Amino acid sequence: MFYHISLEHEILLHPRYFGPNLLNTVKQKLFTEVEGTCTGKYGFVIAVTTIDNIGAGVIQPGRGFVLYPVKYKAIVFRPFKGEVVDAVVTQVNKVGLFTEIGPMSCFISRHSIPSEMEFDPNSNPPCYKTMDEDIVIQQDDEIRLKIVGTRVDKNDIFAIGSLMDDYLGLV
């Protein structure tokens, strides 16, 4: 879920970057470091909104690098298990249904799908209709879900959805 928190980061700056463009360079160097990454503590960070303040540049003795502890205000995406969210169906397969929750994707097997939504591989589009073929749930549909499990894979989040709860379908 998208959130807004004030996070911090300390970046080391090479001496040649000194001069009138110094603080401008500090900002421009922070920008391209922490965007679109993910962590096991705060989760996926979407983008940085504003930079709170630059710390005082501590000249590291021995090397020319000066490190600036800079606090920033960014919007972060961390899903939790049991949250009910909306997503778009990306692929329908007999092995399972693939969705996409923003920067993270999930997957739903037939086990999590009650027997109503039966396979449709004979039709050109793989969908999951019912015996009467009224509720047709195919690719590219805003189908809600419930994250029943979270998993981060080397700075890449991967939750797992389900379809066991009622009112999980077309709005």
Partner 1 sequence: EEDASQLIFPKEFETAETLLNSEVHMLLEHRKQQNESAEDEQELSEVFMKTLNYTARFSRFKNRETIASVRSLLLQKKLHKFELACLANLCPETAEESKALIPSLEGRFEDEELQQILDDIQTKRS
Partner 2 sequence: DQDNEIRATDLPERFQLRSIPVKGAEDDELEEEADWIYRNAFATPTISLTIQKIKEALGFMRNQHFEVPFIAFYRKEYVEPELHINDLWRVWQWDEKWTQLRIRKENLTRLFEKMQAYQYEQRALDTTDMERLKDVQSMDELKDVYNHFLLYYGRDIPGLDGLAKKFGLTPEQFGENLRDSYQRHETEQFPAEPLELAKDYVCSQFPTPEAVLEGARYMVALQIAREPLVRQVLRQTFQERAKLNITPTKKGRKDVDEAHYAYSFKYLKNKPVKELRDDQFLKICLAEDEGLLTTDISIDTYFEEIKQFYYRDEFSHQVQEWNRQRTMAIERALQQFLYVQMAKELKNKLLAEAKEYVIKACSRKLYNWLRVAPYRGIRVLGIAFSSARDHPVFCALVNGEGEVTDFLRLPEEREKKAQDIETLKKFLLNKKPHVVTVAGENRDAQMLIEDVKRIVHEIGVELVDNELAILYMNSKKSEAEFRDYPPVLRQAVSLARRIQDPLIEFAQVCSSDEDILCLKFHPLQEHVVKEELLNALYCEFINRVNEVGVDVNRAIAHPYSQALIQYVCGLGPRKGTHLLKILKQNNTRLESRTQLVTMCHMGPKVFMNCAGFLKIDTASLGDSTDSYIEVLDGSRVHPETYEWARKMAVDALEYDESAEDANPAGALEEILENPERLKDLDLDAFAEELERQGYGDKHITLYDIRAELSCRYKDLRTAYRSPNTEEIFNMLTKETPETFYIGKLIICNVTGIAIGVKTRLDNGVTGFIPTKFLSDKVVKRPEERVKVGMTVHCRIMKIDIEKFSADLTCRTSDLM
Does residue 158 belong to the site contacting partner 1 (CB under 8 A)? no
Quick one: what does residue 122 bind among partner 1, partner 2, none, with the CB cut-off 5 to 8 Å set by partner type? partner 2
Residue 86, C-beta contacts closer than 8 angstroms, at least 6 positions apart:
142, 143, 144, 145
Judged by CB, which is closer to partner 2: 32, or 122? 122
Does residue 51 belong to the site contacting partner 1 (CB under 8 A)? no
Among 21, 24, 49, 123, binds partner 1 (CB under 8 A): 49
Does residue 165 belong to the site contacting partner 1 (CB under 8 A)? yes
Does residue 144 belong to the site contacting partner 2 (CB under 8 A)? no
Q: Give Rg (Cα) of the chain.
A: 23
Among 13, 136, 148, 152, binds partner 2 (CB under 8 A): 136
Tokens of 65: 């690098």
Does residue 166 belong to the site contacting partner 2 (CB under 8 A)? no
Rounded to the nearest angstrom, the gap between the alpha carbon of residue 38 and the centroid of all alpha carbons in its chain is 8
Quick one: what does residue 69 bind among partner 2, partner 1, none, with the CB cut-off 5 to 8 Å set by partner type? none
Q: Looking at residue 132, what DSSP letter applies?
A: S
Using alpha carbons only, what angle is made at residue 106 by residues 100 and 112, rounded to the nearest 5 degrees?
A: 125
Q: Is residue 90 a contact partner of residue 100, using CB atoms and an 8 Å limit? A: yes
Judged by CB, which is closer to partner 2: 56, or 95? 95
